[PDB]
Design a protein around this nucleic acid. Structure first.
Ligand SMILES: [Mg+2]
Ligand SMILES: [Mg+2]
Ligand SMILES: [Mg+2]
Ligand SMILES: [Mg+2]
Ligand SMILES: [Mg+2]
Ligand SMILES: [Mg+2]
Ligand SMILES: [Mg+2]
Ligand SMILES: [Mg+2]
Ligand SMILES: [Mg+2]
Ligand SMILES: [Mg+2]
Ligand SMILES: [Mg+2]
Ligand SMILES: [Mg+2]
Ligand SMILES: [Mg+2]
Ligand SMILES: [Mg+2]
Ligand SMILES: [Mg+2]
Ligand SMILES: [Mg+2]
Ligand SMILES: [Mg+2]
Ligand SMILES: [Mg+2]
Ligand SMILES: [Mg+2]
Ligand SMILES: [Mg+2]
Ligand SMILES: [Mg+2]
Ligand SMILES: [Mg+2]
Ligand SMILES: [Mg+2]
Ligand SMILES: [Mg+2]
Ligand SMILES: [Mg+2]
Ligand SMILES: [Mg+2]
Ligand SMILES: [Mg+2]
Ligand SMILES: [Mg+2]
Ligand SMILES: [Mg+2]
Ligand SMILES: [Mg+2]
Ligand SMILES: [Mg+2]
Ligand SMILES: [Mg+2]
Ligand SMILES: [Mg+2]
Ligand SMILES: [Mg+2]
Ligand SMILES: [Mg+2]
Ligand SMILES: [Mg+2]
Ligand SMILES: [Mg+2]
Ligand SMILES: [Mg+2]
Ligand SMILES: [Mg+2]
Lengths: 144, 60, 67, 185
RNA sequence: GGAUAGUGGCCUACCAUGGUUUCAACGGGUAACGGGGAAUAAGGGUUCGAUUCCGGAGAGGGAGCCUGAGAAACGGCUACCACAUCCAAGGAAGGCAGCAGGCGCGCAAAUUACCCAAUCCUAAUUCAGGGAGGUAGUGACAAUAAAUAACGAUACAGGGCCCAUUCGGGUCUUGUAAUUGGAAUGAGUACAAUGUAAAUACCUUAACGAGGAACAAUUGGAGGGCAAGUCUGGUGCCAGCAGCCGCGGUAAUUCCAGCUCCAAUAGCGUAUAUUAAAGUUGUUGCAGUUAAAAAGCUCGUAGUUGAACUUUGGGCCCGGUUGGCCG
RNA sequence: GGACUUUUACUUUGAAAAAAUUAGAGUGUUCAAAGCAGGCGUAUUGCUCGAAUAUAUUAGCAUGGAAUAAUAGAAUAGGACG
RNA sequence: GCCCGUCGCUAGUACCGAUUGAAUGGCUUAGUGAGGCCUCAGGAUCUGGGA
């Protein structure tokens, strides 16, 4: 029969054996080991809000040549430090050190985006507003 | 990799593409009327069949 | 329009089997309006601080106006 | 602590987002029955989809099984009721057939047009949402009303509105207020 | 025996040495209250359930207990611990995981409003009370219906078609039009009546309320996957884009825009999770010579599995439910 | 009423079974998501259809089957019937 | 052509590691032990042995 039991009473062996082998599932094992909650800069949550420590100019991977504007952000609930990308042209001009920002993932299940080394997050808001809006100029950065 | 590259040039292009304003044009009907206009464009009167068909041709 | 109707055998009987808000609508009863529902509650709770009639406490607290 | 208000959605969306044939196929329908949405087609596909599922199921049961007999009969009479299922093909292997167009053909939108009374599916839309055309004395303003066979005879303008007596209407009457105020006293 | 409402190592005294475990005890984890159920649609499954109903547990943490039919009760008391308020410094007092409201926390969640009219609960009780509950406010959580326009005339242009020796337009409408034509309707505003405990909205409905300066639809995308340009201008491996493959180093189909076009549309994008796709967890149903993978070899307990044979054949009756041909 | 009975699996039919959800019947909430209403007249003293059904499985209960797969039997006869 | 490792730069992650390091939480020995309850007493006062 090659290799699994077929018997009418081999149900236990068949469950155990499955259990044992689920641990080769990358998604399954992270789910049960609680990787999210344990490592990983966000809680396991969709976004996180942090504070802008310094503005970085990350040099892009090959075959691409560019300076990818980013920010080091210290997560508020965490103190965990993180570097995040600041999407679109300009937009680095919209941030500032010690500014509050709202980080989100890069849609890649952890894992860096494209030609940006190290970076697994991107900025979504600053001082409670959102890049997008600031960029398309439908809103303005707040006083202080 | 290197991590303190220049930052001087943020927004370079967007700030130096010259503005040109949007041009006042007819208003397109919204809703069902727009599907209506799509239908007569695509199927009823038709336009060209240079071999097959095109939707956004320019200088053809 | 569709609604509902009642007709009582007497006006003595309506005025006693009708919900009182209804009698108000018609003109057969007066809206005896009162303090706010929570003004009332507050009066109830203040009143709970007192044991007995009160006027005993008026005079005793009138003595205080010497110390 | 109150019983849930129950609900459910009334449409389903295509798995393949950009299939050019399905897109032309959908648009044609929209331009035929005066729809405004791909959803007004999505909706009907979904209605059909369950009806067929029911029928597929019933078919697997033995001929003249009680449920099959009872629940099949019901579904057939419901479909014939509104003019989707022809009198001849009255036995559920054809409800197993049954197309989307068979359903779209029976909307008040279309019926209001099929016997003149509008002379364009779109004139048919505008009239309906604008409180003309009725079924009884009962005004209907929903294009998707789905005209039951035995009300088809009773699609007609409403006693209110123009077109059905009553009164001309504030946009006209406003002109007759410039007729007698310019040319008279 | 004691204790309990009462069985019982529940507790005590005497006595004995038992009880559970690879069919996984015992221990650890749980970002674990359990269930009815939810999401995902070939099927088999996978994942989720703090949360409208049932059960359980708790009232800052522990323990103790009074009353009472019922509590080991917290909008009861007592003590300790932790918080914490008032003071005349002697003292006294507090427990929102009720309703609302505030701080904090954070990606993350609404009014310090109205009423017992309904639904029902309690009391000595038709009457009182009920932040139970109902009402409205905040509210793009989800779900439903579905406005942003409809019709004619005209001006050339057509494709039709009868004729074509050859002008052509003239009727049946295909419709692109920079002058036109009157009709229609609620979005809103609002007498009134209706609604309601009173209000508000809805359903009704006087008077008002549509021509582009609106009463003016969005959100993404247009190289491939993948529906839509090799238009024009800008930048020049910079700025930026790109889930992935890839673009950008001067004619960029990809960036920044203008134009036009596509998709879904009162909605559409992004992030995170999960489900389908996944026969990449495989019971159905995987793969293991060389792609990841047969233990160096044999014995072997648990476990799974395990050749064939024992009333079969023949006879008779009984009454059912479809279906035929007749009715 | 007495006196005695090898032991199981499987399968069948049925009882016991909360509602809401689900599947689904009936009903024109103007349509629909819903809701469980509603429908007829003498609409002046009232007539009337409803508020179904299905699923609900493991285990326990109750009944029918006796294939398939187990269990037990008489060999130091301490066997069986009277 | 492909290509291996030491050595050097920038940045990131996790490991080891003196500090007999630190924090939170659950149990818990020994010692001290509030309180109410039950019980041996007590008897301000106040009745007909009892409160
Ligand atoms: Mg491994
Ligand atoms: Mg590459
Ligand atoms: Mg850094
Ligand atoms: Mg009161
Ligand atoms: Mg009192
Ligand atoms: Mg004992
Ligand atoms: Mg022992
Ligand atoms: Mg195990
Ligand atoms: Mg927990
Ligand atoms: Mg669970
Ligand atoms: Mg629960
Ligand atoms: Mg929780
Ligand atoms: Mg309790
Ligand atoms: Mg608290
Ligand atoms: Mg403790
Ligand atoms: Mg307590
Ligand atoms: Mg309580
Ligand atoms: Mg003092
Ligand atoms: Mg509160
Ligand atoms: Mg409280
Ligand atoms: Mg929210
Ligand atoms: Mg009351
Ligand atoms: Mg009285
Ligand atoms: Mg309340
Ligand atoms: Mg608008
Ligand atoms: Mg306008
Ligand atoms: Mg756009
Ligand atoms: Mg394409
Ligand atoms: Mg150029
Ligand atoms: Mg270009
Ligand atoms: Mg472009
Ligand atoms: Mg979508
Ligand atoms: Mg199988
Ligand atoms: Mg494989
Ligand atoms: Mg190999
Ligand atoms: Mg080998
Ligand atoms: Mg055998
Ligand atoms: Mg059964
Ligand atoms: Mg039921």
């Amino acid at each position: 029969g090659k290799g699994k039991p077929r018997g009418l009473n081999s149900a236990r062996k068949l469950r155990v054996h499955r259990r044992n082998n689920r641990w080769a599932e990358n998604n399954y094992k992270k789910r049960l080991l609680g990787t999210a909650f344990k490592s990983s800069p966000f809680g396991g949550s969709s976004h996180a809000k942090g504070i802008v420590l310094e503005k970085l100019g990350i040099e892009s991977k090959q075959p691409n040549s560019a300076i990818r504007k980013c920010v080091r952000v210290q997560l508020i609930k965490n103190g965990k430090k993180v570097t995040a990308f600041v999407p679109n042209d300009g937009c680095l001009n919209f941030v500032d050190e010690n500014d509050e920002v709202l980080l989100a993932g890069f849609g890649r299940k952890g894992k860096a985006k494209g030609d940006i080394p190290g970076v697994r997050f991107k900025v979504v808001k600053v001082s409670g507003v959102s890049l997008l809006a600031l960029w398309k100029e439908k809103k303005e950065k707040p006083r202080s | 990799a290197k991590v303190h590259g220049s930052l001087a040039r943020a927004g370079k292009v967007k700030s130096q593409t010259p503005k040109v304003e949007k041009t006042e044009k007819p208003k397109k009907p919204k809703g069902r009327a727009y599907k209506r206009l799509l239908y007569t464009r695509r199927f009823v009167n038709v336009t060209l069949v240079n071999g097959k068909r095109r939707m956004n041709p320019g200088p053809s | 329009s569709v609604g509902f109707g009642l007709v009582y055998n007497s006006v003595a009987e309506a005025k006693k089997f009708e919900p009182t808000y209804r009698l108000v609508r018609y003109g057969l009863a007066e809206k005896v309006e009162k303090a706010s529902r929570q003004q009332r509650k507050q009066k109830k709770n203040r009143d709970k601080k007192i044991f007995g009639t009160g006027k005993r406490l008026a005079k005793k607290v009138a003595r205080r106006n010497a110390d | 602590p109150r019983a849930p208000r129950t609900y459910s959605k009334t449409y389903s969306t295509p798995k393949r987002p950009y299939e050019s044939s399905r897109l032309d196929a959908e648009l044609k329908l929209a331009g035929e029955f005066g729809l405004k949405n791909k959803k007004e087609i999505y909706r009907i596909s979904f209605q059909l989809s369950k009806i067929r599922r029911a029928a597929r199921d019933l078919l697997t049961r033995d001929e003249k099984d009680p449920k099959r007999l009872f629940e099949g009969n019901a579904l057939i009479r419901r479909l014939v009721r509104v003019g989707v299922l022809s009198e001849d093909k009255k036995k559920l292997d054809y409800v197993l057939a049954l197309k989307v167009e068979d359903f779209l053909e029976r909307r008040l939108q279309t019926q209001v047009y099929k016997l003149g009374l509008a002379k364009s599916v779109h004139h048919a839309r505008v009239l309906i949402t604008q409180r003309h055309i009725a079924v009884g004395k009962q005004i209907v303003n929903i294009p998707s009303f789905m005209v039951r066979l035995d009300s088809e005879k009773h699609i007609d303008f409403a006693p209110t509105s123009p077109f059905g007596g009553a009164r001309p209407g504030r946009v006209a009457r406003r002109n007759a207020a410039r007729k007698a105020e310019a040319s008279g006293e």
